Amino acid sequence: IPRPIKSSFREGLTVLEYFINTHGARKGLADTALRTADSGYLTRRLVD
């Protein structure tokens, strides 16, 4: 997104900046749940 987050967590984020921040924050948290699942499947194939 070209529009950055000009504010800092010290200065506080505007209402709008928070909405666009959750876009990437939640997508990365959903990636965490997926990567652990595929890595476990990969590990079982390596072991066997």
Next chain:
DNA sequence: GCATCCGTGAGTCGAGGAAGCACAATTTAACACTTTTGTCAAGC
């Protein structure tokens, strides 16, 4: 011979909550009666 489609797989522990009758055949209980067993008392 080629591609569409079926088959298989996608983390680990936890924790918790919802029709009706008749009639023959048969097994089950129910009873009268005999044997088998646990018993009390008296005497050898």
